[PDB]
């Protein structure tokens, strides 16, 4: 087909332009900066109330409350200062794979292997926790869901498309298509304007929330992309693959910046998060550990090893105080 | 000390009690995961048990001889199995369905799927129950057509029993760890008590083996 050859020529032109726009890599610029050595963190608290594997976790906006999702059909809200249980919500479908906490603190969303995203309201006048909405319309499993303004929620599924829903009416306001494989994770921008998503076909796409069209795409990996997160500046992001490699992509340069890998590590990443200053990059691995990389030099700076199974979820507070990790051993851990 | 936090601690303790009770109530049910090929009698097997929204996973709940069985049918997913198959790492048993009525090389792809699911890195120590269900018209099929089309190396008679045994051993030879797993085989039909009793016996055997492995004696 002539269109296939035209597409190949256009891709070659894009690659040539990307190469031409390049310069000396980030290593040359950051060679002379001071490093940070032995970033040692010790477990402060230990939240033990779950009875099965733990698949998701999200920090509250006040940096004190958090929510965790288990496979026994439980969504638990923890107070991170006294290790107390504020709420324990039982779920209709035990096969969950994600959770989110509203930026105002009123709603919590959970989804999973039943093609439905449930939304629960916390502050009612009867004292209990009621289910507020049940968004349905996806064909594959829900992989990750995030809140925007307590009325709009963006979800990602395992059917190559990710949707944007208006909660009050209950229907897909917008749909985003363009991946070939499953979509595994997404992270909203700090200003909630754009958002990136990683797919199970070794590509990451940047979408504009309004007007609903794919803006950019990046391809540097060799296997599935299993986690993704925005740099706090909002002008870069970090992708964690399934072949023991992390990468830092730039929106404006539209190509790769640096890669984080080691010969000793051969497992697959499961979560990625940053620090308030954008200097430390955490990474939850599959070999029971949790590495802490110096994002400006690629040299490893610390190890968090306290878990008896693979670490599945990882998060950092808004003010930058603590770090929460959660694994398949049914224990969360707060590090500081 | 604490001034108003004592009531919060009391709330947390009651919550912990409720979770422990719910967990110990929910950890008494035998988990079975159902797998098969296209229209391979999975609906018939599901209906034969004693016994819109949520299109993905269909959970059936039944009870036989004071044992509470819970079966997950996940055939209506249509996505990569390698991304969500590890959720079922703790299932007690795996039921597999195969239609003996072989027409376009369905046996080869069924064997491929069985090889992929039997040797998976997650389903070690998990026994596999196997049903060969479409046996009512298998004798008609073999008398109207020979089995050498599926297996050119086949060098046996065209009788029902020998062909059935050949297919059964062909499926059972895909196992790699003959010492860890234990494949059970059954030829099911419009009969029901045989199916439920076979599932019950296999579940009892694997339960006994798991108890022995737990108590150190294994």
């Amino acid at each position: 087909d002539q269109l296939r050859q035209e597409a190949e020529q256009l891709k070659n032109q894009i690659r040539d332009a990307r190469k031409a726009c390049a310069d000396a890599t980030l290593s040359q610029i950051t060679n002379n900066i001071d490093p940070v050595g032995r970033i040692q963190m010790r477990t402060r608290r230990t939240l033990r109330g779950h009875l099965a594997k733990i698949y998701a976790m999200h920090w509250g906006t006040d940096s004190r409350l958090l929510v965790s999702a288990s496979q026994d059909g439980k969504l638990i809200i923890w107070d991170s200062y006294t290790t107390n249980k504020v709420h324990a919500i039982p779920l209709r479908s035990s096969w969950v794979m994600t959770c989110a906490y509203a930026p105002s603190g009123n709603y919590v969303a959970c989804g999973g292997l039943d093609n439905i995203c449930s939304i629960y309201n916390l502050k009612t006048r009867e004292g209990n926790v009621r289910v507020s909405r049940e968004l349905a319309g996806h064909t594959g499993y829900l992989s990750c869901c995030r809140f925007l303004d307590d009325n709009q929620i963006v979800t990602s599924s395992g059917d190559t498309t990710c949707a944007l829903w208006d909660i009050e009416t209950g229907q897909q306001t917008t749909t985003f298509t363009g991946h070939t494989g499953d979509v595994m994770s997404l992270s909203l921008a700090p200003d909630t304007r754009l958002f990136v998503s990683g797919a199970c076909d070794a590509s990451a796409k940047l979408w504009d929330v309004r007007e609903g069209m794919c803006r950019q795409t990046f391809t540097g990996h060799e296997s599935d992309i299993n986690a993704i997160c925005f740099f706090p500046n909002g002008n870069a992001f970090a992708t964690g693959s399934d072949d023991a490699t992390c990468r830092l992509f730039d929106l404006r340069a539209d190509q790769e910046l640096m890669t984080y890998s080691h010969d000793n590590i051969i497992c697959g990443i499961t979560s990625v998060s940053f620090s308030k200053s954008g200097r430390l990059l955490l990474a939850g691995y599959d070999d029971f550990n949790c590495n802490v990389w110096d994002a400006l030099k690629a040299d490893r700076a610390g190890v968090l090893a306290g878990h008896d199974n693979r670490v599945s979820c990882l998060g950092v507070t808004d003010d930058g105080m603590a770090v929460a990790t959660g694994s398949w051993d049914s224990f969360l851990k707060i590090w500081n | 000390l604490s001034a108003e936090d004592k009531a919060a601690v009391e709330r947390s303790k009651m919550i912990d009690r409720n979770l422990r009770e719910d967990g110990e109530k929910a950890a008494r049910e035998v988990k079975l995961l159902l797998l098969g090929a296209g229209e391979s009698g999975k609906s018939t097997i599901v209906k034969q048990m004693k016994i819109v929204k949520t299109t993905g996973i269909v959970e059936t709940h039944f009870t036989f001889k004071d044992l509470h069985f819970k079966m997950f049918d996940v055939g209506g997913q249509r996505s990569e199995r390698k991304k969500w198959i590890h959720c079922f790492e703790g299932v007690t048993a795996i039921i597999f369905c195969v239609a003996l009525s072989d027409e376009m090389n369905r046996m080869h792809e069924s064997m491929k799927l069985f090889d992929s699911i039997c040797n998976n890195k997650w389903f070690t120590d998990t026994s596999i129950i196997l049903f060969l269900n479409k046996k009512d018209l298998f004798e008609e099929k073999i008398k109207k057509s020979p089995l050498t089309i599926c297996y050119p190396e086949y060098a046996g008679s065209n009788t029902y029993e020998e062909a059935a045994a050949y297919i059964q051993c062909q499926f059972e030879d895909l196992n790699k760890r003959k010492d860890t797993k234990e494949i059970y085989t059954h030829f099911t039909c419009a009969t029901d008590t045989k199916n439920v009793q076979f599932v019950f016996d296999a579940v009892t055997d694997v339960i006994i083996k798991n108890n022995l492995k737990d108590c150190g004696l294994f």
Partner: single-chain antibody, 232 residues
């Protein structure tokens, strides 16, 4: 939400009487319950506490050993049994609910009260002012004082501002000195520190006329004290 109670009336000295409080419209089995009485022409005073799950019960030093509180979850009813009534126990009673977790708001709904006529170390808090003459459209301030500091090591003070307009039950205005309760106009505000507290109103209408009470929740027993009165 409804917390309607009954059982009061005319009794004799040395008798006994049971009060019942029937709750409908909320998850009753998750709320701690208080009783609060009020004598004629006087202020509010705490009586009794039963927590959620009946694992903690508190009484007042003036009635300990004579009153007994209990709850019934499946029937959703709060019972209080009273023995050896004296002439001082003539008053009108309120059934109150409260739920404690992080960020909650106790004392958020009061009942309707029942009358009871019988024929014939603790923290003390003072509202020196008894009445204030006001006209609509202006701004007013009310002050409350306590013997010891209410600030705790956690960092949150325990002060509650209630309003009682005439002919009705009290209503929660402010909890923990700075948090506005649900369904409350933004005009009201609270501030202060240590042992001095101030509740300010920016504009006044015909609905903001009544008595104002301050309470502390630092330790039991709970002490209200007399209340400032506003009128036009």
């Amino acid at each position: 939400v409804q917390l309607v109670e009954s059982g009061g009336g005319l009794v004799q000295p040395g008798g006994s009487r049971k009060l019942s409080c029937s709750a409908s419209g909320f998850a009753f089995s998750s709320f701690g319950m208080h009783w609060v009485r009020q004598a004629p022409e006087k202020g509010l005073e705490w009586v009794a506490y039963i927590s959620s799950g009946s694992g903690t019960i508190y009484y007042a030093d003036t009635v300990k050993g004579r009153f007994t509180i209990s709850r019934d979850d499946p029937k959703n009813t709060l019972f209080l049994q009273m023995t050896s009534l004296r002439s001082e126990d003539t008053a009108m009673y309120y059934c109150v609910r409260s739920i404690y977790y992080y960020g909650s708001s106790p004392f958020d709904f009061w009942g309707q009260g029942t009358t009871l006529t019988v024929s014939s170390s603790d923290i003390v808090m003072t509202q020196a002012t008894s009445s204030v003459p006001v006209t609509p459209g202006e701004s007013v301030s009310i002050s409350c004082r306590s013997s010891k500091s209410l600030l705790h090591s956690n960092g949150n003070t325990y002060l509650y501002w209630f309003l009682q307009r005439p002919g009705q039950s009290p209503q929660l205005l402010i909890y923990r000195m700075s948090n506005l309760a649900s369904g409350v106009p933004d005009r009201f505000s609270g501030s202060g520190s240590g042992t001095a507290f101030t509740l300010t109103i920016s504009r006044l209408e015909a609905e903001d006329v009544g008595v104002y009470y301050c309470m502390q929740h630092l330790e039991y027993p709970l002490t209200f004290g007399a209340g400032t009165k506003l009128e036009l």
